[PDB]
Design a protein around this ligand. Structure first.
Ligand code: GTP
Ligand code: FME
Ligand code: K
Ligand code: K
Ligand code: K
Ligand code: K
Ligand code: K
Ligand code: K
Ligand code: K
Ligand code: K
Ligand code: K
Ligand code: K
Ligand code: K
Ligand code: K
Ligand code: K
Ligand code: K
Ligand code: MG
Ligand code: MG
Ligand code: MG
Ligand code: MG
Ligand code: MG
Ligand code: MG
Ligand code: MG
Ligand code: MG
Ligand code: MG
Ligand code: MG
Ligand code: MG
Ligand code: MG
Ligand code: MG
Ligand code: MG
Ligand code: MG
Ligand code: MG
Ligand code: MG
Ligand code: MG
Ligand code: MG
Ligand code: MG
Ligand code: MG
Ligand code: MG
Ligand code: MG
Ligand code: MG
Ligand code: MG
Ligand code: MG
Ligand code: MG
Ligand code: MG
Ligand code: MG
Ligand code: MG
Ligand code: MG
Ligand code: MG
Ligand code: MG
Ligand code: MG
Ligand code: MG
Ligand code: MG
Ligand code: MG
Ligand code: MG
Ligand code: MG
Ligand code: MG
Ligand code: MG
Ligand code: MG
Ligand code: MG
Lengths: 69, 571
RNA sequence: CUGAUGUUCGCCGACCGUUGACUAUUCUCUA
RNA sequence: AGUAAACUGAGAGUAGAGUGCUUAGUUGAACAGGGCCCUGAAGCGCGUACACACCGCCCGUCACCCUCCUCAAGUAUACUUCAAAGG
RNA sequence: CCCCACUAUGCUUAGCCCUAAACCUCAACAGUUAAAUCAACAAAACUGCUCGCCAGAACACUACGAGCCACAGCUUAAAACUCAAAGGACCUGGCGGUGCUUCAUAUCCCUCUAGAGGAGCCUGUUCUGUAAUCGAUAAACCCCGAUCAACCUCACCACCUCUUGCUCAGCCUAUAUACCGCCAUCUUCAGCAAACCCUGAUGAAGGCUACAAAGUAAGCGCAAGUACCCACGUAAAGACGUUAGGUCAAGGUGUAGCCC
RNA sequence: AAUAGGUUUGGUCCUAGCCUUUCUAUUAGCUCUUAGUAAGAUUACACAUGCAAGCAUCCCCGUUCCAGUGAGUUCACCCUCUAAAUCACCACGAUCAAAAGGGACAAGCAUCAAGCACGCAGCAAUGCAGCUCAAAACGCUUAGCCUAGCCACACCCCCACGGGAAACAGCAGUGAUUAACCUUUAGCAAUAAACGAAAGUUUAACUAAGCUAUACUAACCCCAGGGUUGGUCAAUUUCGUGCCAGCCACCGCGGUCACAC
């Protein structure tokens, strides 16, 4: 993230159904996404990640819900 | 207790003795490749389908409701004999009441004959032995009976229960006896199923039809299926829209042990999945929602162990770097780290990294779901990941689509179609995107082509052929252009030395150097090829190489050789 | 006359204690 | 200014231990006048992009990384227009 | 940047180029000083009427298109990506290789006296070394905590031993960036602050003129007094704050940790 | 943008963008009891199967309507003149409404500024050289519209002799495709339409049902979940984690005492 925040924010690059590759933030603690998998992305920019304007929807297609605690 | 209530639909408890009504037997024709399974089936079906096949290989499991002359009805499941379709044979054995094992007399027991027998034992289904091809020379029925004894199949002649009927499906000789034997055993089994109540069944095939939509061929096991019945099968439910037979004619009812294609599926069931009837569509969706949730919990628990591993490693690297200094004020730790941050220069690796050349991405599209599972099991027998990696981008059932072309272009993959078509729009789009659609019709053909693409990815295997050998004798220091050039005087013993061909230096068996001569000069004259026994002074391009009195030099010719994939699929 | 350089920071909802239980100031002993 | 400088004694603390420290005394100077040039203070101003405040802030060149855009050789593909006409 | 030499150029003629902080950053014409004057600053506030121009910052006096004697040019002039600000004017303070004025009184310079820096030793520190403490550590550490370490002191190191233990336990364990206590520093300063009042259109803020013009002020410090030999000098005293300055190892103690 | 609110700074004032609070719709997550009603493919991509136009003493009439879709797009409105059609037949007219003539009629871009024959007179021959345009011509792009409804389209070539080719943008259904996903129901009883002189016949128009929290109304002895709880902005206890893991509409939070994970 940009100053003053410090963290390793889990992101991924995904080609959309329109044919535009974009960087998408993966919310929640812990994910298991991998290459070739299908995800649904929504809007909502990551405030501290410059240029990150897409967010993966947890619990749709291959991205599952965060595992409790 | 905030846990999801169980809303699953389960199999009905075993039918009461009163309810049980007699039903037709289900029979499966199991055996090895080209042992006559389809030819035998054709004689009883009274239709010829063997000639009307691609390669004369059965690659599908079909249930045909044959009506015997006595008036009985039997359902014949014609299973494939090829090694690829092991799953299809197991599924047939799980819905069958009798297994008709076709062991050819000429060849005898084979690898897939033993596999067919094993599937029967696991299913615990009586086996009826049919020794086909009895006409041809070397057709010994007795040898087949003896060999089967080793595999726990005991014929009546040897005191066993299995009934062996010698037959010749090509000439229709003795086939009546096998039909009589099958009817006799079915009556002994006393097969009965309640014909009323919620329908039970099993899916034999599931495929996508462009006009009729998602279609599953199934066999009824309990109850009667009618139009408007709500069905659940795994994560897919349906409301029966159309019921048709093998010939496509609509059937109003599907009594137990009947083959019936069913339309109206909101999702495509997996092959072999049990079918259950539910009260209503909202109940069906409730049952499916509870099966999807259970699958998500099982995946979630698996994902948790993987995530806990990634999160435990990171916390160690974080505690280690923090405990590098004491529990001092963070302002000091960043300042003390600033001292070691002034010594730090890392390079960020590109977020998007290049796929290596030795990586084959494949899209698998098939006509039926069982055909796709067969190809996917073959892709799970890949063991040469070191030389080249095989990635499965996407698999599905149906014709090649734009998404398959887009997924192939995204990952630079190759689309493999199995008994599927690609239209001009899809084929033209692939040309623009550079995707390679590889439509096949036979499973041994699609695997051979899969191996040819893997071989291409492999690295070219250089072949080193020794050209000559020469032993050094005297070392000279020549002054040319104000540069001291060490010259190795050598005597060619066996073979010849060529300026183009690469060289290597040998010291008492050790390999010191590998490269090409900078200058080959003999008797103050440059000679490209020195014959055996010719004296030649040798100077290397590497000045660090030290030349002794007894060093050896072996010349060689390097030729790149096409490397073939080590992966063998078992056939 | 020459006189270069020095990584980082501002908002919370506070403010009652009281105090009294002893009952008796009128001795001496007596039976 | 009884200052600096030089000389002498004592005390604290130890069983003992300092060329240290605290303290009493003796002898006993030179310069003190100019200057605002240098470094600061005060008063009254001026300037300010600094505000944990000049040890402040700050511009450009020269990497990795990420995002988007433009130019562009050759070539390919697709789309658009024709008759809204003439003999 | 300073010094010297010299060219394009500045000049004339004839063509071009068409740009300036081309800004008096204040449009032309008519009218008003009436008020509701009036964000601030600047060069007082407005009315009628017309034309021109402007609409977050940056990209951008850029790209592309078009025009032009222009060809590293000029005019017209966007978008995508990015940011949650940019901006204008102020208040207070700091700072200025900032101005003027007056000064420094062991003191800024030129001066005065004796030293340190070189030698040996004594002693502290840093480094190196050792199985072998800790703290101080620019001014404001460095014969410093120590008006004091052969054992002890002692907190360190190695080995051995004890476990309700000198203690209704213990810990010199972490944290002085949680603190009390006791102090350094500006201070070789004179200023801090309650309660009111007034000014600024009731903004952050500000509040002196003695022939006085909005300040009154308890309290604290300076001062005064007291100690020493005076009323002198030296001591002592020296507020509020500054450096998260020093000290958890004087003692106590919040928080966290240890309890064979 | 309002009765407004938060956010530029060390602080104040001004200006300014961004965001917050309100109301709808779609989609996703999680969750969901019943009844009534309304509405209901992402796509002018490709479509299996069934049905959707007959009537009637033969002729005619109808299938040119209804239904569908939104690709294209100032053919929709007013006036003038005036066919076809209805009033059995002429109505010596009314009603309805084409073609033609006149007028009016979307948005964005002027970095689309010139269009290039776009005019007029004459019976004709022919003559004149004009016509539109910074008050926006010409041009490119976008979009069904002004909703008792209207316009346009009907697989494509604007058209449809011809050609490509073999047509669900009729109902139901399906493949592909999209974040987007209704039944392969019944009946001509009502209304509407077609046909008949008529009794009547036909009609996936339509009617009565099926499916779906998208909405509205009502209700229920049993039965409530989603989001939020630092400020804006209603509302937190005990722990864990220690600038890590994470959160955030905005400002921001987390570096060992977190009302923000
Ligand atoms: N001579 C002879 N040939 C026979 C006989 N039965 C079958 N065949 C031949 O064997 C070949 C294989 O026949 P299929 O019916 O395809 O055998 P299958 O076992 O069903 O084959 P898969 O489905 O590939 O396993 C054909 O060429 C037949 O004509 C027989 O009894 N005699
Ligand atoms: C060099 O000239 C070479 C040396 C040989 S040493 C045995 N001889 C011939 O060319
Ligand atoms: K932060
Ligand atoms: K075969
Ligand atoms: K000016
Ligand atoms: K100032
Ligand atoms: K010294
Ligand atoms: K302190
Ligand atoms: K202490
Ligand atoms: K402590
Ligand atoms: K605002
Ligand atoms: K008729
Ligand atoms: K449209
Ligand atoms: K058309
Ligand atoms: K009707
Ligand atoms: K909040
Ligand atoms: Mg978000
Ligand atoms: Mg076969
Ligand atoms: Mg700095
Ligand atoms: Mg500086
Ligand atoms: Mg000159
Ligand atoms: Mg002149
Ligand atoms: Mg001028
Ligand atoms: Mg101007
Ligand atoms: Mg003007
Ligand atoms: Mg310029
Ligand atoms: Mg320019
Ligand atoms: Mg240009
Ligand atoms: Mg001095
Ligand atoms: Mg010395
Ligand atoms: Mg030390
Ligand atoms: Mg230290
Ligand atoms: Mg310290
Ligand atoms: Mg000891
Ligand atoms: Mg000792
Ligand atoms: Mg200890
Ligand atoms: Mg401190
Ligand atoms: Mg005095
Ligand atoms: Mg003093
Ligand atoms: Mg005093
Ligand atoms: Mg400190
Ligand atoms: Mg600002
Ligand atoms: Mg219509
Ligand atoms: Mg559209
Ligand atoms: Mg008429
Ligand atoms: Mg008309
Ligand atoms: Mg342009
Ligand atoms: Mg459109
Ligand atoms: Mg169509
Ligand atoms: Mg057409
Ligand atoms: Mg339809
Ligand atoms: Mg579909
Ligand atoms: Mg929908
Ligand atoms: Mg009629
Ligand atoms: Mg019907
Ligand atoms: Mg309905
Ligand atoms: Mg929902
Ligand atoms: Mg905590
Ligand atoms: Mg929380």
């Amino acid at each position: 993230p940009k100053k003053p925040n410090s963290a390793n924010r889990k992101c991924c690059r995904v080609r959309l159904s329109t044919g535009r590759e974009a960087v998408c933030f993966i919310p929640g603690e812990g994910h298991t996404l991998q290459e070739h998998q299908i995800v649904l992305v929504e809007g909502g920019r990551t405030q501290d990640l410059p240029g990150v304007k897409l967010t993966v929807v947890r619990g749709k297609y291959d991205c599952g819900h965060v595992q409790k605690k | 207790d905030k846990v999801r209530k169980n809303k699953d639909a389960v199999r009905r408890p075993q039918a009461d003795p009163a309810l049980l009504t007699p039903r037709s037997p289900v029979v499966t024709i199991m055996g090895h490749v080209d042992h006559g399974k389809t030819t035998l089936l054709d004689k009883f079906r009274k239709t010829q389908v063997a000639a009307v096949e691609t390669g004369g290989i059965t690659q599908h499991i079909g249930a045909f409701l044959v009506s015997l002359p006595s008036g009985e009805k039997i359902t014949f499941l014609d299973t494939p004999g090829h090694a690829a379709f092991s799953a299809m044979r197991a599924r047939g054995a799980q819905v069958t009441d009798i297994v008709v094992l076709v062991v050819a007399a000429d060849d005898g027991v084979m690898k897939q004959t033993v596999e067919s027998i094993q599937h029967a034992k696991d299913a615990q289904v009586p086996i009826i032995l049919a020794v086909n091809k009895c006409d041809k020379a070397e057709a010994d029925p007795e040898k087949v009976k003896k060999e089967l004894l080793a595999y726990d199949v005991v014929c009546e002649d040897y005191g066993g229960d299995v009934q062996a009927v010698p037959v010749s499906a090509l000439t229709g000789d003795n086939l009546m006896a096998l039909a009589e034997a099958t009817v006799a055993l079915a009556e002994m089994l006393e097969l009965k199923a309640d014909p009323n109540g919620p329908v039970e069944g099993t899916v034999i095939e599931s495929f996508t039809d462009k006009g009729r939509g998602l279609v599953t061929t199934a066999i009824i096991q309990r109850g009667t299926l009618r139009k408007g019945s709500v069905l659940v099968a795994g994560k897919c439910w349906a409301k029966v829209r159309l019921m048709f037979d093998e010939n496509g004619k609509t059937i109003d009812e599907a009594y137990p042990s009947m083959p019936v294609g069913i339309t109206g599926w909101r999702d495509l069931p997996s092959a072999g999945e049990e079918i259950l009837e539910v009260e209503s569509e909202p109940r069906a969706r409730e049952v499916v929602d509870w099966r999807k949730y259970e699958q998500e919990q099982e995946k979630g628990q698996e994902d948790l162990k993987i995530i806990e591993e990634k999160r435990k490693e990171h916390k160690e690297a974080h505690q280690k770097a923090r405990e590098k200094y004491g529990h001092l004020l963070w302002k000091k730790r960043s300042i003390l780290r600033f001292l070691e941050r002034k010594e730090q220069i890392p390079l960020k690796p590109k977020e998007k990294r290049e796929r290596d050349s030795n990586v084959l991405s494949v899209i698998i599209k098939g006509d039926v779901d069982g055909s796709v599972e067969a190809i996917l099991n073959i892709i799970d027998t890949y063991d040469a990941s070191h030389e080249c990696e095989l990635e499965l981008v996407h698999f599905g059932v149906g014709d090649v689509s734009a998404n398959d072309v887009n997924l192939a272009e995204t990952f630079d993959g190759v689309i493999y179609g199995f008994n599927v078509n690609a239209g001009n729009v899809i084929q033209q789009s692939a040309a623009k995107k550079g995707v390679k659609i590889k439509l096949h019709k036979i499973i041994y053909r699609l695997v051979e082509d899969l191996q040819e693409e893997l071989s291409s990815r492999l690295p070219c295997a250089v072949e080193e052929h020794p050209v000559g050998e020469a032993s050094i004798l005297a070392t000279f220091s020549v002054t040319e252009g104000k540069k001291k050039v060490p010259v190795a005087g050598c005597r060619v013993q066996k073979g010849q030395l060529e300026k183009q061909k690469k060289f290597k230096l040998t010291r008492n068996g050790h390999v010191i150097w590998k490269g090409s001569l900078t200058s080959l000069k003999h008797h103050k004259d440059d000679i490209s090829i020195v014959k055996t026994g010719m004296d030649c002074g040798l100077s290397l391009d590497e000045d660090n190489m030290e030349f002794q009195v007894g060093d050896r030099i072996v010349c060689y010719e390097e030729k790149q050789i096409q490397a073939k994939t080590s992966w063998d699929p078992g056939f």
